[PDB]
Amino acid sequence: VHHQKLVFFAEDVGSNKGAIIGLMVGGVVIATVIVITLVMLKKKQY
């Protein structure tokens, strides 16, 4: 099975400062991705 992350550039519909609100609400999936990674990276030891 392949992927399709070409929709990642869809955020261009936004603008600038006001895009913070879009990136914040849409940032829920990116949060869990980076956060899950942070578990294994365990920042500053335990």
Side-chain angles (χ1 to χ4, degrees):
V1 184
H2 204 242
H3 71 292
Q4 192 176 177
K5 246 186 124 68
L6 263 59
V7 302
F8 193 82
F9 297 80
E11 303 204 298
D12 221 294
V13 300
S15 290
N16 54 305
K17 273 275 273 280
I20 193 184
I21 311 184
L23 294 172
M24 271 278 147
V25 182
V28 294
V29 194
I30 297 162
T32 52
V33 176
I34 270 59
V35 173
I36 282 283
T37 312
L38 242 173
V39 178
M40 289 189 179
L41 297 174
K42 43 178 190 77
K43 175 146 63 156
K44 281 176 172 144
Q45 313 97 232
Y46 311 100

